[PDB]
């Protein structure tokens, strides 16, 4: 079952890396930043797959596709993983 984890970026962004999109295999949390919005939410961990950002689907998304979406997701980023 997926989660609706709402974040807010700081001078560190959302606080997590991503990998995948490199072939339609999807995007996965690659690492959590200590102190970051991700970390503090304790609702996302290394390994989680990003299904969508602010209602926008990222299952088939490419890397840069997820990268950019996340990047301009606003200040109130609604993540589904």
């Amino acid at each position: 079952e997926p989660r609706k984890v709402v974040l807010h970026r700081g001078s560190t962004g959302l606080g997590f890396n991503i990998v995948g999109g490199e072939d339609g295999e999807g995007i996965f949390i690659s690492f959590i930043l200590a102190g970051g919005p991700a970390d503090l939410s304790g609702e996302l961990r290394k390994g989680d797959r990003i299904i969508s950002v602010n209602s926008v689907d990222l299952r088939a998304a490419s890397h840069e596709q997820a990268a950019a979406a996340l990047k301009n997701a606003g200040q109130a980023v609604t993540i589904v993983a």
């Binding site: 997590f16 990998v19 890397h63």
Partner: peptide
Amino acid sequence: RRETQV
């Protein structure tokens, strides 16, 4: 090997 921080 692409990995991005966000």
